[PDB]
Design an enzyme around this catalytic site. Structure first.
Site, PDB file in Angstrom:
ATOM      1  N   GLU A  67       0.840  -1.174   0.041  1.00 30.82           N
ATOM      2  CA  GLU A  67      -0.040  -0.129  -0.063  1.00 30.82           C
ATOM      3  C   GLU A  67       0.859   1.009  -0.091  1.00 30.82           C
ATOM      4  O   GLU A  67       0.683   2.253   1.083  1.00 30.82           O
ATOM      5  CB  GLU A  67      -0.920   0.030   1.085  1.00 30.82           C
ATOM      6  CG  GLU A  67      -1.698  -1.209   1.303  1.00 30.82           C
ATOM      7  CD  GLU A  67      -3.029  -1.266   2.381  1.00 30.82           C
ATOM      8  OE1 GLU A  67      -3.745  -2.405   2.332  1.00 30.82           O
ATOM      9  OE2 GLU A  67      -2.957  -0.394   3.247  1.00 30.82           O
ATOM     10  N   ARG A 122       1.379  -8.406   1.135  1.00 31.84           N
ATOM     11  CA  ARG A 122       0.510  -7.644   2.169  1.00 31.84           C
ATOM     12  C   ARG A 122       1.185  -7.634   3.360  1.00 31.84           C
ATOM     13  O   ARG A 122       1.112  -6.818   4.453  1.00 31.84           O
ATOM     14  CB  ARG A 122      -0.872  -8.271   1.953  1.00 31.84           C
ATOM     15  CG  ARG A 122      -1.828  -7.884   3.134  1.00 31.84           C
ATOM     16  CD  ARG A 122      -3.124  -8.449   2.929  1.00 31.84           C
ATOM     17  NE  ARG A 122      -3.885  -8.290   4.063  1.00 31.84           N
ATOM     18  CZ  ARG A 122      -4.817  -7.243   3.991  1.00 31.84           C
ATOM     19  NH1 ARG A 122      -4.892  -6.256   3.236  1.00 31.84           N
ATOM     20  NH2 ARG A 122      -5.704  -7.145   5.356  1.00 31.84           N
ATOM     21  N   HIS A 192      -4.280   3.656   5.227  1.00 32.14           N
ATOM     22  CA  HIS A 192      -4.312   2.162   4.340  1.00 32.14           C
ATOM     23  C   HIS A 192      -4.607   2.828   2.646  1.00 32.14           C
ATOM     24  O   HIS A 192      -4.995   4.075   2.610  1.00 32.14           O
ATOM     25  CB  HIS A 192      -5.162   1.277   4.656  1.00 32.14           C
ATOM     26  CG  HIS A 192      -4.856   0.456   5.842  1.00 32.14           C
ATOM     27  ND1 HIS A 192      -4.583  -0.962   5.822  1.00 32.14           N
ATOM     28  CD2 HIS A 192      -4.659   1.027   7.190  1.00 32.14           C
ATOM     29  CE1 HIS A 192      -4.462  -1.265   7.286  1.00 32.14           C
ATOM     30  NE2 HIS A 192      -4.412  -0.113   7.751  1.00 32.14           N
ATOM     31  N   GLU A 266      -8.617   4.782   3.830  1.00 32.61           N
ATOM     32  CA  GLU A 266      -8.320   4.267   2.504  1.00 32.61           C
ATOM     33  C   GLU A 266      -8.205   5.375   1.539  1.00 32.61           C
ATOM     34  O   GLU A 266      -9.141   6.011   1.210  1.00 32.61           O
ATOM     35  CB  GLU A 266      -9.269   3.272   2.221  1.00 32.61           C
ATOM     36  CG  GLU A 266      -9.709   2.397   3.423  1.00 32.61           C
ATOM     37  CD  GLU A 266      -8.741   1.200   3.476  1.00 32.61           C
ATOM     38  OE1 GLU A 266      -8.056   0.795   2.765  1.00 32.61           O
ATOM     39  OE2 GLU A 266      -8.494   0.733   4.644  1.00 32.61           O
TER      40      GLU A 266
HETATM   41  C1  LIG Z   1      -8.103  -2.427  -0.790  1.00 30.11           C
HETATM   42  C2  LIG Z   1      -8.270  -2.026   0.729  1.00 30.11           C
HETATM   43  C3  LIG Z   1      -9.681  -2.241   1.181  1.00 30.11           C
HETATM   44  C4  LIG Z   1      -7.393  -3.391   1.626  1.00 30.11           C
HETATM   45  N1  LIG Z   1      -7.726  -4.584   1.562  1.00 30.11           N
HETATM   46  C5  LIG Z   1      -7.171  -5.582   0.915  1.00 30.11           C
HETATM   47  O1  LIG Z   1      -5.982  -5.485   0.547  1.00 30.11           O
HETATM   48  O2  LIG Z   1      -7.701  -6.904   1.299  1.00 30.11           O
HETATM   49  C6  LIG Z   1      -7.350  -8.062   0.634  1.00 30.11           C
HETATM   50  C7  LIG Z   1      -8.115  -9.020   0.912  1.00 30.11           C
HETATM   51  C8  LIG Z   1      -9.082  -9.301   2.162  1.00 30.11           C
HETATM   52  C9  LIG Z   1     -10.059 -10.331   2.394  1.00 30.11           C
HETATM   53  C10 LIG Z   1      -9.978 -11.150   1.427  1.00 30.11           C
HETATM   54  C11 LIG Z   1      -9.243 -11.316   0.069  1.00 30.11           C
HETATM   55  C12 LIG Z   1      -8.303 -10.199  -0.241  1.00 30.11           C
HETATM   56  P1  LIG Z   1      -7.150  -2.900   3.293  1.00 30.11           P
HETATM   57  O3  LIG Z   1      -6.562  -1.367   3.298  1.00 30.11           O
HETATM   58  O4  LIG Z   1      -5.926  -3.918   3.596  1.00 30.11           O
HETATM   59  C13 LIG Z   1      -8.637  -2.869   4.027  1.00 30.11           C
HETATM   60  C14 LIG Z   1      -8.317  -3.156   5.777  1.00 30.11           C
HETATM   61  C15 LIG Z   1      -7.529  -4.503   5.849  1.00 30.11           C
HETATM   62  O5  LIG Z   1      -8.036  -5.498   5.204  1.00 30.11           O
HETATM   63  O6  LIG Z   1      -7.040  -4.685   7.089  1.00 30.11           O
HETATM   64  C16 LIG Z   1      -9.418  -2.959   6.503  1.00 30.11           C
HETATM   65  C17 LIG Z   1     -10.823  -3.563   6.088  1.00 30.11           C
HETATM   66  C18 LIG Z   1     -12.212  -3.335   7.001  1.00 30.11           C
HETATM   67  C19 LIG Z   1     -11.983  -2.610   8.321  1.00 30.11           C
HETATM   68  C20 LIG Z   1     -10.653  -1.891   8.639  1.00 30.11           C
HETATM   69  C21 LIG Z   1     -10.498  -1.186   9.768  1.00 30.11           C
HETATM   70  N2  LIG Z   1      -9.952  -1.958  10.979  1.00 30.11           N
HETATM   71  C22 LIG Z   1      -9.519  -2.294   7.740  1.00 30.11           C
HETATM   72 ZN   LIG Z   2      -4.524  -2.304   4.061  1.00 31.46          ZN
END
Ligand SMILES: CC(C)[C@H](NC(=O)OCc1ccccc1)P(=O)(O)C[C@H](C(=O)O)c1cccc(CN)c1
Ligand SMILES: [Zn+2]
Length: 304
Positions: A67, A122, A192, A266
């Site tokens: 990210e 990640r 993020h 985000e």
């Molecule tokens: C593109 C974005 C939405 C990122 N998500 C991601 O890369 O997901 C991968 C993924 C997750 C589940 C299944 C398959 C792939 P993220 O900033 O990371 C989102 C982030 C996370 O997953 O930790 C998140 C999601 C919901 C609530 C919070 C608050 N605590 C934080």
């Molecule tokens: Zn993230």
């Protein structure tokens, strides 16, 4: 080799934490709060005009390795602070009255891996017993409905919650520091990408936070403020419903620690480029985000 409008490798970010502090000792002190699994230094920058018993706001970047705009934002924020202190009235008050704890990169091991091997990594880069699979999802690794939902117990998965809450040196280092400064930390902000959202609790349970009403009003005004600059539109709301459920999140944990103003940002974009946000959007992205961060800061400050 540092530039605020390009993505910098860890080598360069580390040197930068040393140099920016060198050049601005009356606004920045630098400490290490721990080491990563692979022995990198988890730096924290205390940004503000030094003084007795000041309240603080905590902001981390680089939870998730791929990210990159997140890492870029923390760097940008620090320059904004130091260059405008004393000239821009708001930032001058902010740094006078409070401190920003800026943790530029939490998951340094993974960040280095996105540069050296796999741009889409990640997790952390710690080993796991009994498997070749590597890494733990740091934002599923905090004590908040830990591994109850949106988390995998499988080391080979991208949302692996770890062997136990705070099993990661990095997440442990962060929680320890916040835990040791709970009296002074007034808000928690974790950066993020992507999705263009401001999220607040809860993420590990559909239950609402006690101060849900003001948090929504706060997130709402912040996204409005963010939009005035380039028209970039965020959505906002509780984590569980605004994007998807995910337990073990640092913001949920921060909140349940007593930090009433806890947010996950985000940043750009909404999927056009995803994690591979062009360097040509770094400036505009950080600029509009600065406004939402300063709006929040201004609000928290008037609410001490
Ligand atoms: C593109 C974005 C939405 C990122 N998500 C991601 O890369 O997901 C991968 C993924 C997750 C589940 C299944 C398959 C792939 P993220 O900033 O990371 C989102 C982030 C996370 O997953 O930790 C998140 C999601 C919901 C609530 C919070 C608050 N605590 C934080
Ligand atoms: Zn993230």
């Amino acid at each position: 080799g540092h530039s605020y409008e390009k993505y910098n490798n860890w080598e360069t970010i580390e040197a930068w934490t040393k140099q920016v502090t060198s050049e601005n000792p009356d606004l920045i002190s630098r400490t290490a709060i721990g080491t990563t699994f692979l022995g990198n230094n988890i730096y924290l920058l205390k940004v503000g005009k030094p003084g007795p018993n000041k309240p603080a706001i905590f902001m981390d970047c680089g939870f998730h390795a791929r990210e990159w705009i997140s890492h870029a934002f923390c760097q940008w924020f620090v320059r904004e602070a130091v260059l405008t202190y004393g000239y821009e009235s708001h930032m001058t008050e902010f740094l006078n009255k409070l401190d920003f704890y800026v943790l530029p990169v939490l998951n340094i091991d993974g960040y280095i891996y996105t540069w050296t091997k796999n741009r889409m990594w990640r997790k952390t880069r710690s080993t796991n017993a009994g498997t070749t699979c590597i890494g733990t999802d740091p934002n599923r690794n905090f004590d908040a409905g830990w591994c109850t939902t949106g988390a995998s117990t499988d080391p080979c998965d991208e949302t692996y919650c770890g062997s136990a809450a705070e099993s990661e040196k990095e997440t442990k280092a962060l929680a320890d520091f916040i835990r040791n400064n709970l009296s002074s930390i007034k808000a928690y902000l974790t950066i993020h990408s992507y999705s263009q959202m401001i999220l607040y609790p809860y993420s590990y349970d559909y239950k609402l936070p006690e101060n849900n009403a003001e948090l929504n009003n706060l997130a709402k005004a912040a996204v409005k403020e963010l939009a005035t600059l380039y028209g970039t539109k965020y959505t906002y709301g509780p984590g569980a419903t605004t994007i998807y459920p995910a337990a073990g999140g640092s913001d949920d944990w921060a909140y349940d620690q007593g930090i009433k103003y806890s947010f996950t940002f985000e940043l750009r974009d909404k999927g056009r480029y995803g994690f591979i946000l062009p360097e040509s959007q770094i400036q505009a992205t950080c600029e509009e985000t600065m406004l939402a961060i300063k709006y929040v800061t201004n609000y928290v400050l008037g609410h001490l």
